[PDB]
Write a protein that binds this DNA or RNA. Structure first.
Ligand SMILES: Nc1nc2c(ncn2[C@@H]2O[C@H](COP(=O)(O)OP(=O)(O)CP(=O)(O)O)[C@@H](O)[C@H]2O)c(=O)[nH]1
Lengths: 205, 496, 82, 85
RNA sequence: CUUGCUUCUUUGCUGACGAGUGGCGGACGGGUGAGUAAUGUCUGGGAAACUGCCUGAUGGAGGGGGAUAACUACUGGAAACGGUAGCUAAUACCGCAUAACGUCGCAAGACCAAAGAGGGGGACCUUCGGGCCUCUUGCCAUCGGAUGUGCCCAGAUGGGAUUAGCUAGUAGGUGGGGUAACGGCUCACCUAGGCGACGAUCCCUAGCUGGUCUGAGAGGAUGACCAGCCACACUGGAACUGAGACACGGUCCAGACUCCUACGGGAGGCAGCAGUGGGGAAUAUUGCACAAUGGGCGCAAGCCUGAUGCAGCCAUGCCGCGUGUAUGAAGAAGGCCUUCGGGUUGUAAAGUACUUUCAGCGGGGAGGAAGGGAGUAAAGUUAAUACCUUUGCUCAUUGACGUUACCCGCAGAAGAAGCACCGGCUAACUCCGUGCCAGCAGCCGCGGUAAUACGGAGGGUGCAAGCGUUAAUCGGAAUUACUGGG
């Protein structure tokens, strides 16, 4: 299910920083970004329409860590909702529990947040959840149980939370590690760079 | 004085072992008469007998055969020997005594074929006591030589019986004369022949010993018995000796200690997987050692070597050879169960004692010719049904990698058993034989990890799957086995 | 003979009974006249545990429907003064 | 088939004479009245109808006749005997 | 002989209970779609009907008789399985009395039935068999309600015209018989009608439907699992019991196939659950229990249930989780390429610091459990504080799953990642080896000594406990055009 491989090769493959190597350290410049995705990375591709559709889809997926059948299920869930499909798809991607744990700063990277959810530490509404694909309902409160609270791995990785944008749609206590979920995020708030329209183009055919 | 142990004492074991062409089948068919109930099968007769219930267990008697009896003489406490006078003490009997001296079984012998010519009795007893180095104590001796054998004269019973001819079909009784020095017996038999018989009985009293009870258990002085198997006479006196001489069924050795016949945790492990006759099903067999513990109908056995709680409620009893209904019994009997490719030979059973016995005799056979699949449609009956026969002690099927030319394993010579067994409900391929040379002992070996992997790597075209997913190596010559020993396969060795 | 009885719907290790009026010769999950109410035995204390319309049940009592033991226990659960 | 519930077979054998024999004598009485229809004697027809009426009503009572067959017999036979008379 | 300690023959006198008579169920539950093109199914109406078990109302339930099994004595057969001669009971059978809004009839008139059992007891009466009083339950007759079933009509429900005539109980009518009931359903007579180009008769195929898949919709294939109906129970025919069968685990006869025989004759029908042979590419365990539901019987307790509730196997389909995370440049070793400068594999691996989902082990531990049994109290019932119904209340409790879901603790990254593709369609590049050969390929198409196509290596791409191929349906295909072509 999980990739567990070259998480920094994917950032060179898409060119943009996928935040898979976020970590305690800052922007690395230790892998020759944008100029070497692989062995023949010096070639300039033709980069057609289906090409940029597939690159955009795999970019959003390796940001969010969602497999293809699971993302197609998210697209099928977002297609039957109201409004428009592109906002609803990214809202369902943000509604994952491990993404909420990542936005709270409870872990440096996304795989660390998925491991923290999976190892019976993340608890929402007094009920412990192991599945990282937990659809977070609005008006919930997420925290860490007392038997797994602050064994230093949440601690220094919380300092990275002092360097992030700290978005509006969720609030962390940062004294007892008790987060608070709020209303759904607007499209003009989440990372301002990814394109949902190419994903709609790919899953429309 | 509980009746449980009192009928533990009423369960005894005599299988039968003998020479080829000795008369196992005739004497078992005639003991079927005595309770109101060549050679390719095994059969178990429980009995409807009056006094006790003493089981039988047949076996094919040859040198290429009888790998059954190397592991089912371990099952049986006692021993019946059948020796002909024309055959005498031969290499078959020496091999069977090499088997029976290892466990000290009580032995009662039965000289057969009293219709044909038989040598002098003292010469035969000296042949036994010389070529076996084991003494004996005779009780009777019949009349004269040739066809003149018409009587039996007991010593420790003092009973004189006569014989009538042509009684092989019906059960008939001959009248009884009590006295030993009766002149009317001399008139009915013949005076000079009876005087020669009395002189031979005096030579018995002057040149032999008496009977023992504590040394009978070890089997030092093994008693003999006389009579024919066809004349319906000589085996009728065997039953009293079967009642009076044979003890309780002995404890058997485990890895910890001997388990007695008064305990629990049923020790019924499988001895033979028999050459199965197939009406519609296999069931494979389960001949067992349930000497310890009285059965239950809804008992749940425990497979020790796989350590699983297996619910087995169906158990066949061998009443007069026919596989009878679902019946529980008294301990000291041999069952038959319903398995589907799960239980091999020697798989132990307890209710929690996770230990093993000291059995598992019979390893390896010469390599005969092949399977080449005449009428090549529906190969699956030999890809299953002979691999079904591969769990037996006689047949171990070898699968080479090239997916043709599958070797039938035989430890004996006569593979006509499998050829006749290829004409059953789930057996329809012929596979007529020829001459193909594959030499000897595909010596089975499965080494420890990280070291047999390179051994699979270097000569990957020189392996062969076995019955039970084994890979011995491949045996075409002795020089290849010398190269295999030179290759140094350090192994946690199990022979299989 | 008509009767009011449970139907045993739901998933494996997740029972969900259907109290229903049906003929006795029909199957459990078979043909029925009409359904009235339901019962969930694994329903812990929450917003809804058991719905049961007593008007149609009284109508079938007025017609001659034999009430089983579980349906009579549900009638004694839905008590007129409690 | 070997079954403990074979008793309903031979007991139905115990039925298939006796009840049917009653049906037998029933219909012969009916046929007797038809003889009167072939006779033309209205008094004998009335006597035969009065002879057959209580036994056919008893056979309608004992479950053999379903009280509409015997009603049909009484109906059309009464119609014949008062059309003749 | 420890004289009330133990041994022990009779004894239905009790609790109960093989076999037998009888009542009910066996027509439900379960399996398959062989047959069937309308005798079937669906949609919608209708009368000339039935309806045990459920229930409402109104009455009766009186008085007698004869057989029989089981049981005895003899006897036939190997068995299966009886026969002869006696005895006995019933809620089994059969008369007699008696009826009404019931049946027939225009009416007068005629006819039609049963069965009693179990619990408790005051007075009286006991030939001491018990009547008698009360309660519960069962029976008969009628009117009904509901349920299910039977019957009729219209429409709809595949192809073939290289199937154009079909029909003689055929079409209608009268009369008799028959069906719970209309009915050529069946017989006697009379006439020549009846169907049909808006497909009659014949052939092939097919269970039908709600539904499933696909499709924006209209449509197309399918209808396997869930559910309703129909048909079938090795093949065909036939009746009986029973309210309901012209009958899966009922009967007989005729035929095919296995088995026994003492050869006189019998037993059998897995298109039940399991399991086997054969077929085929292809499909499971000869498992646990009535713990819960439902069905059958019984007042009830209790009994059966291969339906069911589960357990085992199969990645067959869907879903989720993990196989680590953070840091870590000498940008190490090895592989590949090279313009031999260097790049790639590659934060990948090694090292360091944490963590352990799921597996292994050791302990707690719900819920699926309602009921039912014993005892007590109160209210009904009745002469009755006795019996019985109902409701609180006290006690002992009822789990195959189950070494349960779930929770806690131990240890160690420790046990857990593969499959296809890389010329275009369509996501991704080189090197080496042959050389229109070996070979690949869904289409266009490559390989003829510089192959981004074959094989191998490196790298990348895509999907993920699944990945490719094959087989089928729909869309794209407005290339069957009614929407929507000439
Ligand atoms: N007349 C006579 N013939 C006998 C007697 N015993 C055996 N036979 C004959 O000897 C032969 C032995 O036959 P069988 O019973 O099959 O021998 P077996 O001992 O079973 C053979 P194996 O040892 O291989 O199991 C037969 O031909 C049989 O008729 C006997 O007492 N009398």
């Amino acid at each position: 299910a999980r990739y567990l491989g070259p998480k920094l090769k994917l950032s060179r493959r898409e060119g943009t920083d996928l935040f898979l190597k976020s970590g305690v350290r800052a922007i690395d410049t230790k892998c020759k970004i944008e100029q070497a995705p692989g062995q023949h990375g010096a070639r300039k591709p033709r980069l057609s329409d289906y090409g940029v559709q597939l690159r955009e889809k795999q970019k959003v997926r390796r940001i969010y860590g969602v497999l293809e059948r699971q993302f197609r299920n998210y697209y099928k869930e977002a297609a039957r909702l109201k409004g428009n499909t592109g906002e609803n798809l990214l809202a369902l991607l943000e509604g994952r529990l491990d993404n909420v744990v990542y936005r709270m700063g409870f872990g440096a990277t996304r795989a660390e947040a998925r491991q923290l959810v999976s190892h019976k530490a993340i608890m929402v509404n007094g009920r412990v959840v192991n599945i990282a694909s937990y659809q977070v309902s609005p008006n919930d409160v997420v925290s860490i149980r007392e038997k797994a609270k602050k064994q230093s791995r949440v601690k220094a990785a919380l300092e990275l939370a002092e360097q992030r944008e700290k978005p509006t749609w969720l609030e962390v206590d940062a004294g007892k590690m008790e987060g608070t979920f709020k209303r759904k995020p607007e499209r003009s708030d989440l990372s301002a760079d990814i394109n949902e329209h190419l994903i709609v183009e790919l899953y429309s055919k | 004085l509980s009746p449980y142990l009192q009928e533990v004492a009423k369960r005894r074991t005599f299988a039968i072992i003998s020479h080829p062409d000795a008369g196992k089948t005739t004497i078992t068919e005639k003991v079927l008469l005595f309770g109101q109930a060549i050679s390719i099968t095994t059969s178990v007769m429980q009995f409807p007998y009056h006094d006790c219930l003493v089981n039988l267990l047949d076996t094919p008697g040859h040198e290429d055969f009888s790998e059954d009896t190397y592991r089912t003489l371990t099952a049986v406490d006692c021993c019946l020997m059948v020796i002909d006078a024309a055959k005498g003490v031969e290499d078959r009997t020496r091999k069977l005594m090499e088997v029976t001296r290892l466990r000290d079984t009580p032995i009662l012998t039965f000289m057969n074929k009293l219709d044909r010519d038989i040598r002098d009795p003292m010469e035969l007893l000296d042949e036994v006591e010389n070529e076996l180095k084991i003494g004996c104590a005779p009780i009777t001796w019949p009349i004269g030589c040739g066809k003149l054998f018409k009587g039996v004269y007991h010593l420790y019973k003092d009973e004189t019986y006569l014989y009538q001819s042509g009684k092989g079909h019906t059960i008939q009784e001959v009248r009884i004369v009590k006295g030993l020095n009766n002149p009317d017996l001399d008139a009915a038999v013949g005076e000079d022949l009876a005087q020669q018989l009395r002189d031979e009985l005096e030579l018995v009293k002057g040149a032999s010993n008496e009977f023992d009870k504590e040394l009978f258990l070890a089997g030092e002085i093994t008693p003999v018995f006389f009579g024919t198997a066809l004349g319906n006479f000589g085996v009728d006196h065997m039953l009293d000796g079967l009642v009076e001489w044979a003890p309780a069924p002995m404890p058997r050795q485990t890895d910890t200690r001997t388990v007695e016949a008064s305990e629990d945790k049923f020790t019924g492990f499988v001895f033979k997987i028999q050459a199965n006759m197939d009406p519609k099903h296999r069931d494979r067999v389960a001949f067992m050692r349930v000497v310890s513990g009285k059965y239950e109908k809804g008992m749940k056995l425990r497979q020790v070597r796989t350590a699983k709680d297996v619910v087995i409620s169906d158990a066949l009893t061998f009443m007069a050879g026919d596989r009878s209904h679902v019946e529980e019994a008294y301990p000291g009997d041999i069952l038959g169960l319903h398995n589907h490719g799960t239980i091999q030979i020697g798989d132990t059973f307890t209710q929690g004692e996770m230990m093993k016995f000291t059995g598992i005799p019979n390893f390896a056979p010469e390599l005969f010719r092949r399977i080449r699949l005449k009428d090549p449609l529906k190969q699956k009956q030999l890809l299953k049904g002979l691999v079904q026969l591969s769990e037996e002690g006689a047949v171990q099927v070898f699968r080479p990698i090239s997916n043709n030319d599958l070797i039938v394993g035989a430890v004996g010579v006569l593979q006509f058993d499998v050829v006749v067994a290829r004409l059953k409900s789930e057996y329809n391929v012929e596979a007529v034989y020829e001459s193909v040379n594959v030499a000897t002992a595909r010596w089975v070996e499965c080494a420890d990890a990280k070291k047999f992997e390179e051994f699979k790597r270097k000569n990957e075209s020189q392996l062969a799957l076995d019955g039970g997913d084994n890979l011995a190596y491949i045996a075409t010559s002795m020089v290849n086995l010398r190269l295999a020993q030179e290759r140094y396969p350090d192994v946690q060795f199990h022979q299989t | 003979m008509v009767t009011i009885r449970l139907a045993r719907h739901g998933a494996k290790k997740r029972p969900f009974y259907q109290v229903v009026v049906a003929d006795s010769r029909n199957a459990r999950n078979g043909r029925f006249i009409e359904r009235v109410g339901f019962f969930n035995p694994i329903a812990s204390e929450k917003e809804e545990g058991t719905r049961l319309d007593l008007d149609r049940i009284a109508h079938w009592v007025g017609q001659g429907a034999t009430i089983s033991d579980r349906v009579a226990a549900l009638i004694k659960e839905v008590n007129k003064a409690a | 088939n070997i079954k403990s519930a074979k008793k309903r077979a031979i007991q139905s054998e115990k039925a298939r004479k006796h009840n049917a024999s009653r049906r037998s004598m029933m219909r012969t009485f009916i046929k007797k009245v038809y003889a009167a229809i072939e006779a033309g004697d209205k008094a004998a027809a009335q006597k035969a109808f009065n002879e057959m009426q209580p036994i056919v009503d008893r056979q309608a009572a004992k479950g053999l006749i379903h009280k509409n067959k015997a009603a049909r017999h009484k109906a059309n036979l009464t119609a014949q005997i008062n059309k003749l008379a």
